[PDB]
Design a protein around this ligand. Sequence first.
Ligand SMILES: O=C(/C=C/c1cccc2c1oc1ccccc12)NO
Ligand SMILES: [K+]
Ligand SMILES: [K+]
Ligand SMILES: [Zn+2]
Length: 427
Amino acid sequence: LPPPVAIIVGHNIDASAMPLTYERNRFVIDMLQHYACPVFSHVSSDVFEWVLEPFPVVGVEDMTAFHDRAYLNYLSIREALSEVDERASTVKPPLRVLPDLVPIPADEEYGLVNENMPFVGMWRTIQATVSGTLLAARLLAQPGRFAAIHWFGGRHHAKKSTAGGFCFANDVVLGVLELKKLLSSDKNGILVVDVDAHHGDGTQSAFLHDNSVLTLSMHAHGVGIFPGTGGIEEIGAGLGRGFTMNVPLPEGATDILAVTLMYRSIHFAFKKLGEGLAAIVIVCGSDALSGDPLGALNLTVGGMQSIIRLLLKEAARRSLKVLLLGAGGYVDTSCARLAGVVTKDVLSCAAAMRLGKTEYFGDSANLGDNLGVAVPEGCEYFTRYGPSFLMHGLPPARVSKLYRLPYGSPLFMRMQRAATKEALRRR
Ligand SMILES: O=C(/C=C/c1cccc2c1oc1ccccc12)NO
Ligand SMILES: [K+]
Ligand SMILES: [K+]
Ligand SMILES: [Zn+2]
């Protein structure tokens, strides 16, 4: 049997890097090597496998399981269809990377505009992302495997024939689909939990009518919060009714709202899926963390870790498979801090399972109550983790903290109907 955790890295960690978060993969892998991995090493380990090859060469045919073929064909040749925008680029070769292309009218049909402007290398970064997630899904389906971790994937906004929010191919959907065909036909329900600060609209649209994939998204929601969808009334369609869950949060929400509500929704989702549940895929963005410039929430590292600990614990008990993906996140150090403690939790949990234990997190500090964990001084990027140099440290809040739902909140009202039909039945 292989090590129960596969950490999908690849040989060029910049392959999937995007122009706005170009350095982020480096912070994440650095934090994994110096915070999460050592305690389970002796690199060699019986807990995790550091995957660096082979990455399948993927093309249009490995993405048609979800995406419209004309859309994919266009992405795969778009860099041949116009010149680099040299007015937009004040720094010239050899000191530039991934520059914007000049737009063409055909970009409009496929949403390749604004934040999804095409750039040189875009098809290669799409290939790296999809390839990594497909490899992670295939390794996860092997026996003896508890989890596969691809911090570089998780482009949850892409739709069947539209790009959006920096996502072109939806490797979440493609990863769920590849997992789906490789799991036993007796047990292959999938729960996908999306704790990125933005509505997982691509993923939800791919499974709106499906009752074998339950999509649960936590996200900020409000006027001028991207992408605009994800209200409490989106509950699915047809056979899929009841298998789409949204937890839309007020801008600035803290752990006391987000964590409480996600715990409540996750337990509902476990129930709606019952014993057919086989795998959980976690889309773990770090832009919900307080201080993020684009996410408009105020979660703590400990709060995000807490949500994910509930999913890991349930997967360990019932012997499920876990596919962990990254997503958004626009502070490099917050992204690596979060990736570090979530990964250490996954390893600690898998190590506990192989020893027969029922206490899963004994090797990984709980940042919700331990505010003294230091960033490893061996981190290459260590000097960036100030002023605290602690694993829970976050930049000052960009939006005011909210601890109570606003007056009139439809989230509260939906609780209200149910939350009093509870105390009534218990009487
Ligand atoms: O990270 C993401 C995507 C974030 C994003 C992409 C494009 C535009 C905006 C984005 O966020 C915004 C907030 C306010 C106004 C505009 C935007 N998805 O997971
Ligand atoms: K989300
Ligand atoms: K669904
Ligand atoms: Zn996001």
